[PDB]
């Protein structure tokens, strides 16, 4: 309340809408992928078990922050272009599942 | 009883000098607010649509004489 002056949240306009079908992913970066040893197959179940991912959300997306330094077979729902390129260029492989 | 027909004034426009002679200013700094050319744009100084004088480069402000009855403001690079 501003003593009768029009409040800020009445003088400003409403904006946008909420998407009812919005998808949000649990994100894993390459520096988090460093935790596993070479040759390991990474799955959402493995990620939740080892504790990297706490809540699965709409799926698991691999992102390209940090440096991987390991050779892994990463099975996830989504990969960023940089994450896929780094996984493939470190000797490993990735698959969208 | 009676009444007055006056009692009006517009908001004051805060005109006049905004930076001092010998002061360093970044480019775009407003140097002078005015109606008309009370002071002219000199070297490296522009004149806006509402007669505002502003610096076109970074440098030092110099208010200087321009003829007998006019003056100008310039901005010179420090180097």
């Amino acid at each position: 309340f501003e003593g009768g002056q029009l409040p800020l949240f009445r003088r400003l306009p409403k904006r946008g809408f909420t998407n009812i079908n919005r998808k949000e992913y649990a994100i894993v970066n390459l520096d988090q992928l460093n935790k596993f040893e070479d040759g390991t197959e990474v799955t959402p179940a493995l990620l939740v078990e080892s504790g990297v991912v706490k809540n699965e959300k709409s799926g698991i997306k691999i992102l390209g922050n940090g440096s991987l330094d390991k050779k892994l077979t990463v099975k996830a729902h989504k990969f960023s272009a940089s994450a896929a390129e780094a996984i493939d260029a470190k000797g490993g492989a990735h698959e969208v599942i | 009883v009676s009444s007055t027909k006056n009692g009006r004034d517009s908001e004051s426009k805060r005109l006049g000098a905004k930076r001092a002679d010998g002061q360093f200013v970044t480019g775009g700094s407003i140097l002078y607010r005015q109606r008309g050319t009370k002071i002219y744009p000199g070297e490296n100084v522009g004149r806006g649509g509402d007669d505002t004088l502003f610096a076109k480069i970074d440098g030092v402000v110099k208010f200087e004489r321009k003829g007998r009855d006019k003056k100008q403001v310039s901005v010179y690079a420090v180097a």
Binding site: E2, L8, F9, R10, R11, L12, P13, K14, R15 | -
Partner: protein, 65 residues
């Protein structure tokens, strides 16, 4: 009981990474002939809730993250 969010405010702002509130701009509904082209172009751009207003209205959006 739980504090209630201010629903109109929640419809008008969004929360940035550092905790600021992104807001839209007033004078963007109509009467566009009475406003210059530069005025409307720059009114198109969002701003933040000011610090003084934030001091006033922070608790209304405490749950909005």
């Amino acid at each position: 009981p739980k504090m209630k969010t201010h629903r109109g405010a929640a419809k008008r702002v969004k929360r940035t990474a550092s905790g600021q509130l992104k807001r839209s701009r007033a004078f963007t509904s109509h009467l566009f002939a009475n406003k210059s082209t530069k005025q409307k172009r720059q009114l198109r751009k969002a701003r933040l809730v000011s610090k003084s207003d934030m001091k006033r209205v922070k608790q209304l959006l405490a749950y909005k993250k």
